[PDB]
Amino acid sequence: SLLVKKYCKMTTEEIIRLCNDFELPREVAYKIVDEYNINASRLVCPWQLVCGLVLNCTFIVFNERRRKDPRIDHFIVSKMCSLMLTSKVDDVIECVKLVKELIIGEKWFRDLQIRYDDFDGIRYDEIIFRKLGSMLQTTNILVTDDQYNIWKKRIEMDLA
Amino acid sequence: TKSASSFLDTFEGYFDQRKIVRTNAKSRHTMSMAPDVTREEFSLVSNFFNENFQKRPRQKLFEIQKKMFPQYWFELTQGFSLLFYGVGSKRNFLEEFAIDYLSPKIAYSQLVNSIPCLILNGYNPSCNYRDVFKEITDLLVPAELTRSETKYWGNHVILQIQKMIDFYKNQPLDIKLILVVHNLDGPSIRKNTFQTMLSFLSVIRQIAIVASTDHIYAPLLWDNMKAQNYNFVFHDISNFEPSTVESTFQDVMK
Amino acid sequence: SRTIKLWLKKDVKNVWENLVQLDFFTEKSAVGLRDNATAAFYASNYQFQGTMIPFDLRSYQMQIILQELRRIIPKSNMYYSWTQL
Amino acid sequence: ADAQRSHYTVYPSLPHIPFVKLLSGKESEVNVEKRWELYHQLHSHFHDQVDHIIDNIEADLKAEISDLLYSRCFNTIFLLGSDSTTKIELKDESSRYNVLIELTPKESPNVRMMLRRSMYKLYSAADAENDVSYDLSLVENFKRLFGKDLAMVFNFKDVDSINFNTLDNFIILLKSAFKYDHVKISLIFNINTNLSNIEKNLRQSTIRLLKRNYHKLDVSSNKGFKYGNQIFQSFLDTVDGKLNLSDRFVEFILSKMANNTNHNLQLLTKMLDYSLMSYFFQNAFSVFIDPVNVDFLNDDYLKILSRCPTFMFFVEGLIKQHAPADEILSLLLEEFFVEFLVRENPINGHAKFVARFLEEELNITNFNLIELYHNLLIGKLDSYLDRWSACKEYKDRLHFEPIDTIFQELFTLDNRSGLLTQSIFPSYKSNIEDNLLSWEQVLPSLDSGDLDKIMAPVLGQLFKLYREANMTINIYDFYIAFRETLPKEEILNFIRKDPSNTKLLELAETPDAFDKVALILFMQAIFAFENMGLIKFQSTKSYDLVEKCVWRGI
Amino acid sequence: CLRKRIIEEDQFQNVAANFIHLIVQAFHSYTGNDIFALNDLIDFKWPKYVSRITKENIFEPLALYKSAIKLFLSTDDNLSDLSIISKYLLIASYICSYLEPRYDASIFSRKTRIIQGRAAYGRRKKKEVNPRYLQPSLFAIERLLAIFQAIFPILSALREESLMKANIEVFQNLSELHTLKLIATTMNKNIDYLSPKVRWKVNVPWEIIKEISESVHFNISDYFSDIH
């Protein structure tokens, strides 16, 4: 288990290797590098911080693919347990929640949230009406128009 | 002065940030090293930054918030009191909602003058509950107490409001008064008699209650009986407004 | 250890109230009976802090000290040895 | 100025329903008015039954107190969980005045005021159907003045709030009336906490006095769930055949109803009411709970109803069961929508059936109909009925499997958006903390554009440094930390954007300009924090250190 | 009752006097020399003593005493519904009132550290005075809410954040606890609830909070066993 190993040694090359197996953009990868570098002397297990950083960035960058396909959300963490050498998935989401405290309110995290238009899993135009307590907020008990359209196209493909 | 604490949030952060700092680890930095600023340049820079910094996002957000105005009107017609809260001044929002929107809608739906709006500036420390009830008795003309209803050195305001509650239960449910309360958790209106008076007025279905709160601990003011009487629907309206009107009663130099 | 029935807390509460009533105990820093009717009227409209906390936590002081009890309690009493520390 | 006044009245200037047009504004106004009137009949049908239930609570509760109050000591009644709102009645009993005396803690600062108010009320009530002294000699002279015997019923309201020394001395005072042969005294105590909390505050001789004849009465609405079940059943019979209730909604109702004990019924009424308002305000299919609107089918109704997952499951089961493709494309509907919205949905009538069978045929009364309805919704009614050890022989008669009907998602009360949580029971201080910390979920990011783009609003920027700091903050070091985040060049360019303001242009070319601007903005945000309650000055005349008061996530 | 008991199945005066001396011998240490308290005890225990009078007992005083011996071992002069949030707020207020605020991280802190640091070590040596025998200490609102959050009971858990935050129900329950005077303040009239100068303290004894904690199956004694 890579999350158990205390005071371990790592370089930026391993960080780029982890960030290139998730196909993140390069600026986000160097911001992950800088975020590890400004905390590197004070982590009991730096792989905990790195795991939370890449998981929180890969939730944000592919928010549209996660919206149109939830199984990607069941893929990515299921892939990353293969890289942290852990069988249970609870420590990975614990890493996500523990790192989430340390980067919320940071300027680059907020700019990433703005430019991908992703604030805790939804766009601004939905979160403003859930914050206002609107009765007309787009609740999710039906399916969206894009999901309905791609499902209708897929079922018309498999009909003939 | 960032803390050397492992935690930030929850009780973990609360217990981790309340540790003991040694005397040599403290900073003896004072206000004498700050640049000297007079009142006039304070006023000049504040009214410049409060009128040009982030004004366009505040304008667009405020145009989003008036799409909530029919839902606010519908919640007021079903007997709920509106409580607004958030970061920033909510005074302009409350007067714009109650005067420019809500009173003509109530007056036209009850068909010729519009509904009177009684404004309570709870940010004013001189807000007095007896004079507010004097204005209410001029606006609503309730029946005066008889001799058996005065009890024995009772509070005449509370007994008169209880008589008003017993009267208005058998009246048509048409709104006769719009009570706007800016800063319901303000320095004098947060007291127990003022809150009791306002919750018993909120019992009456013919008075619409639109209130705002600024303190982070404002729901501590209301127990089960006052929460039942107030009948609040809560609405978060954060706008990061300057709040320059409410700051005139405090000293910004201190 | 060296028999006497040990009474429970609920029964000792009545003995405690009887000892307060017989002026063996006195509430801490209590003024008591005021000098004039105006001071008594001012006191009667004040809510004292001792009247709201539970009875087991009220501070009290002795009107008779342990040395005086050793002076008065006879030698043949079964609690005479505990009038010394 | 009106802004500097204590209060002022504005007679607005007058230069028609709050429901809006749905279907992206393409709904007709006829459907909007029909939704309005439909909501009004549903709300009236629910609230008439609720008013009748509340009146029956009042009538039966006065009946129980009147039974316990009648048929040389006090007659003591302890009303547990009372909340002291009920009007207690006394009968007409000839040759005897029955006088009822209400006392609150506000009317009881000392024993003298208790006796003076009690004898004033006694004399006023005796005169209502030569001045006297308002003391206990009015009690001993009552048969000399008025000729009949006296029965005083004292009702102490909010007994957990009255000073107990005053109440003990008042009971000891009222003990003096036992030597008069024409006086009987009843005491009614509105106990809110429990009886053991009351007797630990009274003296032991007073408890021995009160022990001669006392009656306990649980007067709460939680006892037996008899009044909550009637309100929930009234809501069910309002929406029977029209609307469904989700298991999430009923679980939310139970979880919120557990958190409030003294005021349970009107919280339930408020929650059901707000769910009904939310449904009739957000859903254009509400007109289809009336069968006369089935000619109001348009296109946008069809594309909204085609995204139902029950329709999704039904058509994929249809392509599982039907090999040819011609019948599948014909459905992908308007006529098929009509024939299924008139289904009976007999779960409400069966819930009434098991309710009356549990109450009147098995003599079991301690059941929550809301919890029973939740267990019937999730399919575990047998696991709810196997507790009393008497429904074992009736386990097979009361069996019910849930039928996940088609297009029930357009007619249901749910909470999967958190609207009921954000409106009725919000996380108030958590919402304030999260709006301060994040702030990009509040203010839009439109793309002084440069300074708005690269500098935060001042309160959020102050909160970001506030949260990462210690309990005790130096104000000057806080200002130094706040000044480092600000842009030193773009702010000085921003205050030079307006050439009309001359004093700001004069102050901009000062060599100490940026520090002055930073200190002004910092001080304004610090006083905003102080007014919100986030910080506290731990002094009176220095104002050099502050203490953190609020932590995010608590 | 006595003349009903003799028909259901000087010496009457003998058995009444014997009951009076038995009451005095059982309860003189409790009542003292109070005529009134012994009169109440006689009135309370006379019908329960009459109800255990038999033909074998009417002329045998020692056997009649042994038949109704329960009336003389206990005085029995007594008269013998909060929310879950109110119950845990009362427990947390008792904890705040009787534990000093410099060791809470040594009891309640449990969460995994990403940043290097140390929690509180704990109290070094135990005190030999039980602090619940004294008056309660004063605390702030946020300490009470922090300890209440600590002691309240607990891929879809990723978006859960399973920790209860102080919403308006918690503050409403706290205000209800204050208006019932199970919590108290430093001032009693014209109370400024929102001032940071106003502090809070518990207002229940140990027995009340003990039966409250056993009502919710909370181990409140485990926070007091190691401290003294």
Author numbering:
A (entry chain F): 271 to 430
B (entry chain B): 233 to 343, 355 to 497
C (entry chain D): 424 to 425, 447 to 529
D (entry chain C): 16 to 30, 38 to 93, 100 to 157, 179 to 381, 388 to 502, 510 to 616
E (entry chain E): 214 to 222, 230 to 300, 323 to 396, 405 to 478
What is the paper's account of this structure, in its own sentences?
Our 2.55 Å resolution cryo-EM map of ScORC·DNA afforded the location of active-site water molecules (which were not resolved in any of the previous eukaryotic initiator structures due to lower resolutions) and a better definition of the side chain positions of active site residues. As expected, the conserved Walker A lysine of Orc1 (K485) bonds with the β- and γ-phosphate, while the Orc4 arginine finger (R267) and Orc1 sensor 2 arginine (R704) engage the γ-phosphate (and also the α-phosphate in case of the sensor 2). The Walker B aspartate (Orc1-D566) binds magnesium through two water molecules. The catalytic glutamate (Orc1-E567), a residue that activates a lytic water for nucleophilic attack of the γ-phosphate during catalysis, points towards the ATP γ-phosphate, its position stabilized by tether residues in Orc4, Y232, and R26332, and a bonding interaction with a water molecule in the magnesium coordination sphere. Surprisingly, the side chain of sensor 1 (Orc1-N600), a conserved polar residue in AAA+ ATPases that supports ATP hydrolysis by helping to activate the lytic water and/or by bonding with the ATP γ-phosphate, is flipped away from ATP. Apart from the magnesium-coordinating waters, two additional ordered water molecules are observed in the active site in a cavity near the γ-phosphate (W1 and W2). W1 hydrogen bonds with the catalytic glutamate, while both W1 and W2 also directly bond with the γ-phosphate. However, neither of the ordered waters is correctly positioned for an in-line attack on the γ-phosphate. Together, these findings argue that the Orc1·Orc4 ATPase in DNA-bound ScORC prefers to reside in a pre-hydrolysis conformation. Thus, we predict that the following rearrangements are needed for ATP hydrolysis: (1) a rotamer switch of the sensor 1 residue, (2) repositioning of at least one of the ordered water molecules in the active site for an in-line attack, and (3) a slight shift of the Orc4-R263 tether may also be needed.
The coordinated action of multiple replicative helicase loading factors is needed for the licensing of replication origins prior to DNA replication. Binding of the Origin Recognition Complex (ORC) to DNA initiates the ATP-dependent recruitment of Cdc6, Cdt1 and Mcm2-7 loading, but the structural details for timely ATPase site regulation and for how loading can be impeded by inhibitory signals, such as cyclin-dependent kinase phosphorylation, are unknown. Apart from Cdt1 and Orc6 (a subunit of ORC), all loading factors belong to the superfamily of ATPases Associated with various cellular Activities (AAA+). Here, we report cryo-EM structures of ARS1-bound S. cerevisiae (Sc) ORC and of the ternary complex with Cdc6 at sub-3 Å resolutions.
